[PDB]
Amino acid sequence: YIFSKLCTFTITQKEFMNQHWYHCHTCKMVDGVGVCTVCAKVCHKDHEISYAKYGSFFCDCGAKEDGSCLAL
Ligand SMILES: [Zn+2]
Ligand SMILES: [Zn+2]
Ligand SMILES: [Zn+2]
């Protein structure tokens, strides 16, 4: 995919690609909902996060329609 340092939603939109992603128990982003590597570091700093898996995914942090993601 393209080079970017931002949230991978930048790359995927609501289509999917293989990537590492995380759960956030603080934000109740669990099961099939989670966050990309950038958002885990930035938007969820000091939250209770955990590794989910590597697989087909788009970032639900970047996808939040209120624009609260800090990683574009
Ligand atoms: Zn993200
Ligand atoms: Zn969180
Ligand atoms: Zn984010």
Author numbering: 1656 to 1727
What does the primary publication say about this deposited structure?
The N-end rule pathway is a proteolytic system involving the destabilization of N-terminal amino acids, known as N-degrons, which are recognized by N-recognins. The E3 ligases of the UBR subfamily recognize and degrade N-degrons through the ubiquitin-proteasome system. Our findings suggest that the UBR box of UBR4 recognizes type-1 N-terminal arginine and type-2 N-terminal amino acids containing an aromatic ring, such as tyrosine, tryptophan, and phenylalanine through pi-interaction with two phenylalanines of the UBR box of UBR4.
To overcome this issue, we purified the protein with the N-terminus starting with tyrosine (YIFS-UBR4UBR) using the LC3B tag system. Using this system we successfully established the crystal structure of YIFS-UBR4UBR. However, unlike the structure of the arginine-bound UBR box of UBR1 and UBR2, the direction of the N-terminal tyrosine residue was not toward Asp1721, but toward Phe1671 and Phe1713 in the binding site. These two phenylalanine residues on the ligand-binding surface of UBR4UBR create a hydrophobic patch, which explains the binding ability of residues with aromatic rings. In these pi–pi interactions, the distances (Rcen) fall within the range of 4.7 to 6.5 Å, which is the typical distance range for the pi–pi interaction.
